[PDB]
Amino acid sequence: KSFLWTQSLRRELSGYCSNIKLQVVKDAQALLHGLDFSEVSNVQRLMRKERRDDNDLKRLRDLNQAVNNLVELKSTQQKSILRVGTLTSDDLLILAADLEKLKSKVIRTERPLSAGVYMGNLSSQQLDQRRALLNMIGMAGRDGVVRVWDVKNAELLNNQFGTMPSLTLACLTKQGQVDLNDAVQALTDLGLIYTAKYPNTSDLDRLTQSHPILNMIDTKKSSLNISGYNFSLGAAVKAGACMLDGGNMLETIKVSPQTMDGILKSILKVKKALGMFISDTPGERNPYENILYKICLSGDGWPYIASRTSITGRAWENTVVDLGLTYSQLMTLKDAMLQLDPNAKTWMDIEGRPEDPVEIALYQPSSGCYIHFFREPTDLKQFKQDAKYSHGIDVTDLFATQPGLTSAVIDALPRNMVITCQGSDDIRKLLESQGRKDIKLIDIALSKTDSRKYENAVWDQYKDLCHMHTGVVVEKKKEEITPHCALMDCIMFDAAVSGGLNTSVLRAVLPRDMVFR
Amino acid sequence: IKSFLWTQSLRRELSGYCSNIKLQVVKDAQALLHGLDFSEVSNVQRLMRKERRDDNDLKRLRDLNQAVNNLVELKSTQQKSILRVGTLTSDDLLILAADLEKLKSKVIRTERPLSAGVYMGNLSSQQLDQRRALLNMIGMDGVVRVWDVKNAELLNNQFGTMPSLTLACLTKQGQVDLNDAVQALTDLGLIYTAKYPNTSDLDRLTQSHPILNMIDTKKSSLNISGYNFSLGAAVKAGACMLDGGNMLETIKVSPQTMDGILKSILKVKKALGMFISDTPGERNPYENILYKICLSGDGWPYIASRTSITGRAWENTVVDLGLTYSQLMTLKDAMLQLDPNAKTWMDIEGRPEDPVEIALYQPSSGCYIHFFREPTDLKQFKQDAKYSHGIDVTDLFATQPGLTSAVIDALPRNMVITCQGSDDIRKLLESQGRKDIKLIDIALSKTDSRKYENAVWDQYKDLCHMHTGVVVEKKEEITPHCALMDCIMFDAAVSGGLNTSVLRAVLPRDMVFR
Amino acid sequence: KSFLWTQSLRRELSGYCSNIKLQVVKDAQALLHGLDFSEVSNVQRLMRKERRDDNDLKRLRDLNQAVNNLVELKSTQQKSILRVGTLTSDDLLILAADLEKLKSKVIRTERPLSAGVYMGNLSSQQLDQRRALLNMIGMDGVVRVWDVKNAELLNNQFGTMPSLTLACLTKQGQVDLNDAVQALTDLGLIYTAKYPNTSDLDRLTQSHPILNMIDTKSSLNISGYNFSLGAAVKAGACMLDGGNMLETIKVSPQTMDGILKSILKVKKALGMFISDTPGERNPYENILYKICLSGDGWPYIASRTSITGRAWENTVVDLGLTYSQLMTLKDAMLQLDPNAKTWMDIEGRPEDPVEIALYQPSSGCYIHFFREPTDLKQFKQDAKYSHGIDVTDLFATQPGLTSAVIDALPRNMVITCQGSDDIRKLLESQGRKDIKLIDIALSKTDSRKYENAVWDQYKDLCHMHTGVVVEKKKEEITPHCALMDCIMFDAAVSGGLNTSVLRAVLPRDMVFR
Ligand SMILES: Cc1cn([C@H]2C[C@H](O)[C@@H](COP(=O)(O)OP(=O)(O)OP(=O)(O)O)O2)c(=O)[nH]c1=O
Ligand SMILES: Cc1cn([C@H]2C[C@H](O)[C@@H](COP(=O)(O)OP(=O)(O)OP(=O)(O)O)O2)c(=O)[nH]c1=O
Ligand SMILES: Cc1cn([C@H]2C[C@H](O)[C@@H](COP(=O)(O)OP(=O)(O)OP(=O)(O)O)O2)c(=O)[nH]c1=O
Ligand SMILES: [Zn+2]
Ligand SMILES: [Zn+2]
Ligand SMILES: [Zn+2]
Structure with a gap:
């Protein structure tokens, strides 16, 4: 079960966690004082479009930049090269294998948003298989290609869609028209449930009588469906996690080049203890896929909760291991081929x-x-x-x-x-x-x-x-x-x-x- | 923990007997805030702080209980039940009878010394330690007793917790808005869907819900009243705030559903290997539900006012189909009252x-x-x-x-x-x-x-x-x-x-x- | 650390140490002149077997007997009763508690080699826990090394002895005795200041070819006919003129209480303890085991293969289950097949x-x-x-x-x-x-x-x-x-x-x- 992987990761990584409520709240106040929320509203409108272009991407990237400028909890660009030491030789082979697998899963999850999937003149079975991929990844038109983002450089989409607790807090406050304090409180309560269980819609229902501000949360959205400007339960839980001056929340982990290797070593211990794995299917991440991706993106920041939007590159580019296509590769290639019009x-x-x-x-x-x-x-x-x-x-x-x-x-x-x-x-x-x-x-x-x-x-x-x-x-x-x-x-x-x-x-x-x- | 596994299994099996009683508990807590003398609540708390109490003290308690009972609609009423073959099989009744006999012994050795007393004077170091161990297990001229009373049967059922009373006391004696206590206990109820809340959980909950710092985690189900703020009391009240999750606390029993409920408990028992322990002190979830239901075939066994119920569970629910080991433990323990030197x-x-x-x-x-x-x-x-x-x-x-x-x-x-x-x-x-x-x-x-x-x-x-x-x-x-x-x-x-x-x-x- | 404890014990016991190089070489010369090293090769072959029986055991015990017959450094069967005197009443309580703890650690270490541990149809979690124990102690469906009628015949059959290690290196490594002597002397020198590690051994082999006979990977599931780092270091300790090496201690019934009193002074000073972990002995568990086996011999270096009994049976203190016994009991139960x-x-x-x-x-x-x-x-x-x-x-x-x-x-x-x-x-x-x-x-x-x-x-x-x-x-x-x-x-x-x-x-x- 996913929560068990999470709780064991919490238990093992407790020494890397901290109390960050104050900093998240100060960042939220800086956005509230400094951000154009009509521009937040504008970016929410653009994310509701079924088809987005470079003009839409520029608005999102400029807003992300403006958010980045106002906050102190920010990740910095930090390439990491993993060599034998704290990590063993076999640790490094495990990590290089799992990162190859994550590369495959992430590419197959994200690339078709911009590359596109041909859905015109195909057999019934082909259409069914393709629809299944699209549904699995949260995904018109011309012609007949289905493509959410039409952009000259798809690389400018990297890392522009993450949720950040200070942004989530500032937006609930400003866009939901409640006091910051009442927003903190509603999130704290969600945070508390999360010490014990993943909160579900039923739990959130009970909380909304106490804090009507939680009515803004869509329980149907997943992190595949959202930007940092949208109100998924995932975003709210991650914010609530930060409000506790208390209990080993993975969301409060800081990484530095001095602690990366050890944090990764601790993850591998839980991996072996629980039999955690990287999935072969694209779409939503399990706790292990998620922690590994977030840590490897930058050896300098707060992997879950800092602003990550100035980070260039992918996690398999930013963290590398130093000492016939695979199945993972072949699946990427098969899905990339779906862009072709077989009739053209x-x-x-x-x-x-x-x-x-x-x-x-x-x-x-x-x-x-x-x-x-x-x-x-x-x-x-x-x-x-x-x-x-x-x-x-x-x-x-x-x-x-x-x-x-x-x-x-x-x-x-x-x-x-x-x-x-x-x-x-x-x-x-x-x-x-x-x-x-x-x-x-x-x-x-x-x-x-x-x-x-x-x-x-x-x-x-x-x-x-x-x-x-x-x-x-x-x-x-x-x-x-x-x-x-x-x-x-x-x-x-x-x-x-x-x-x-x-x-x-x-x-x-x-x-x-x-x-x- | 094995225990929370027992509770969760009971919740699944018994879910059709659970109910949505948020509004009734809150309405009851409302009648108490409007009706009850809270200085008398305070007076009864003062008396519970005494190491030694007498019939005058028991008087104040029972009278305030009567006052509480008169104000709430969630009340258990006297309902004797006789279990005969039918929905419960021949084999079922043997099991329940063997189990009630075990529970009876356990419960007496837990509660009787509070009034019967235990001689702690001139005894060997060995005997004093063995007695101290028993005393610690149960919450407690040579004799240590807590209740010095003419008719100790007047202690029966005067000490249960009830969600409406806990909510009303938190509110008034804590000086917060009702909605504040509801909110805090709701949170506590939510945690209790997934685990039993512990001190750590309470600590984290309090930082945002100051009202919960009235709960003292040292205090236990044993030797405490409905007027005191134990973690157990708060957990029970929170269980009632959810309107869901198959909370054992919200079960209602009637003369029509009693045999069926006990049949489901017995089902869970056989599946989980649940048992009555011969150790005195804290009740396991099986021991506890069995006690609470058999007290009356008509009420809410966990959360109603039960202070008007006379009798004990093994008296109000009976199986119709020398000393046993269970009685010999009760006997060996009751004999501890004697002063060997007198x-x-x-x-x-x-x-x-x-x-x-x-x-x-x-x-x-x-x-x-x-x-x-x-x-x-x-x-x-x-x-x-x-x-x-x-x-x-x-x-x-x-x-x-x-x-x-x-x-x-x-x-x-x-x-x-x-x-x-x-x-x-x-x-x-x-x-x-x-x-x-x-x-x-x-x-x-x-x-x-x-x-x-x-x-x-x-x-x-x-x-x-x-x-x-x-x-x-x-x-x-x-x-x-x-x-x-x-x-x-x-x-x-x-x-x-x-x-x-x-x-x-x-x-x-x-x-x-x- | 263990070497810290060793250093303190050396300081405090130095009056009981002696130079014994001449007697060690004399014994090794007696083996070289008297022992069948084809039979030593045969017992090494038998120890390489993953599973051994009573015919294997007889071979080992007969060879040990032949060794024992040939050397003068030998411990003698000597029961010790510890009474108030040189040791105070409190000393005796400490020592009684420690011997009980050591008994538990020793049984948990050695007994599964013969009693066996079930490793068949069990959960992932059980197999992981049992594998961890087996790795700790150096170890159908039941894993066991010795299948024998009477496992007490295993007692005291696996100790290393400097004369034997010296004789075996010489004959089986085909060098002059003096070459082996000088090689172990250099190892002993290193041991005055640190426990020798693989780099120390690697460095020494470049000047002493004989030393590449030594394996760096322990004292568990080996014998005196094996060339462990432990055995070689012990031999080297005996090659030195002085330097307070614990390996050269002799005990008699007259000195026994005084040696134990001195160990207890070190225990108190350093906070030494008997661990609850099965596997390798720390220096306090080691010295206490070796001293309490016999009140008459050279606890580290004499032939011990004729001693019957355990250390907690041969030395006793005359003055509802403990934690240590419950640990022993939980491990004993691993022998059972839950499915059988x-x-x-x-x-x-x-x-x-x-x-x-x-x-x-x-x-x-x-x-x-x-x-x-x-x-x-x-x-x-x-x-x-x-x-x-x-x-x-x-x-x-x-x-x-x-x-x-x-x-x-x-x-x-x-x-x-x-x-x-x-x-x-x-x-x-x-x-x-x-x-x-x-x-x-x-x-x-x-x-x-x-x-x-x-x-x-x-x-x-x-x-x-x-x-x-x-x-x-x-x-x-x-x-x-x-x-x-x-x-x-x-x-x-x-x-x-x-x-x-x-x-x-x-x-x-x-x-x-
Ligand atoms: C390009 C694009 C991606 N996405 C989704 C798909 C990407 O895999 C996803 C990446 O999010 P991050 O992984 O960037 O989001 P997060 O860190 O908040 O995730 P989590 O809630 O687990 O902490 O964003 C959109 O919703 N819309 C888009 O237009
Ligand atoms: C004689 C005496 C009994 N008792 C009580 C201790 C217990 O509260 C009571 C037995 O429990 P009830 O079953 O009476 O209490 P409860 O239902 O609230 O317990 P729980 O929180 O598990 O639901 O006997 C005293 O507190 N003081 C006394 O002086
Ligand atoms: C039962 C059994 C014991 N043993 C032995 C291995 C060890 O040599 C022995 C412990 O013996 P000593 O404790 O007799 O070993 P030692 O004194 O040579 O070791 P050191 O001084 O370096 O600490 O337990 C086996 O090797 N296989 C077995 O099957
Ligand atoms: Zn070209
Ligand atoms: Zn009479
Ligand atoms: Zn018999």
């Missing part, structure tokens, strides 16, 4: 020979999504020739690429997809070698001159999407020419067929974290 | 090898042992009836067997016993293997022996109802000889007079009769 | 029992113990018509075991018995209702078919029944023993009686005293 015109192109590919790309011009990844060659002799005369890739730059993607991506391609390419024999052979004989191919056969008419235009617009081509490439007359990229080739070949290049933002299908290791 | 008379009626009435009397503290035995020699008995005791043999059927051996076994080591016989007493004590007891033969003349005979019967007639037959001497009719009255009159003869004095029965008048 | 068929039977009434037995026939273990009666009048009837126990023979039995054993019985056991009503009441008395009972109800006649075969095999298991017992008809009959009953009631249900070694769950010195 889809280009494919490769660099390297089809029995030895080093760069592969697929491109759907209509929605603008692309698949793009790399493979280390087997035949280094032939690679060197292809490097001089085609692709200009330095082999040593491929060392950091994720192995196994060629198989895995090709296996995950929609059944009966139709692929368009420039030179059909190479593609067929590659697809057949990976066991896909069902994919139909359209060979375009453009002339060499017609093929590269939009070459300069494509590289002018889209250069930032590929940095792999570093070597000078020549052609026999020898003259220097622009290197061939699988991805740019899909885009220029499509532009040549279409008779023009549009200025479109493109959407990467694979996470960068999967393309490279 | 002057002690012993007299018997019937010959030494066939006793029918035995008595011992310690004139200094006024306590007495008195019981009966069925004769083996019916021939010699009828002669004894005509010439000595006038006891009708059939009136002895109703007396408890095996007291002769158990009492003589439990008599304190090295006691000096005074008697108008010595020889019949010796033989009998030797018969039971008590050679260590020293005897003083007083050898009074026939006529000096019975100088105070009328005086003694005049004052103490109600203490023995067993002598019914006409007794003659060579013939003229004479006053029958009673073992108890003889001890008293022989003592008066030696003393040169008889004091007007209340005596104390060492044995429960409930162990003498079956 | 288990008989129970009692003599005396359930309210007043005087003999209790439980028996698991598959594994062969039995719980068996006594209690003094409350009602002597009923007891005397039971003595004449059932059990034949003389009440004065119950005086010497350990009280408090009824409550303690029953409270300690595995959760959810199923118990088989002949007549269920008395067992129920007794179990109910200690609030054990989780224990399910099976009433086997054999006829009186079928009951006791195997009565004579059981007594013929197992008489030595109960000596309590001395009274003549009779059955009205009046004729003499065989007294009824709770233990023998479980055994014969089992044989009747099984249709035969196997010849089977039985194992007592409880230590004998827990049943008595």
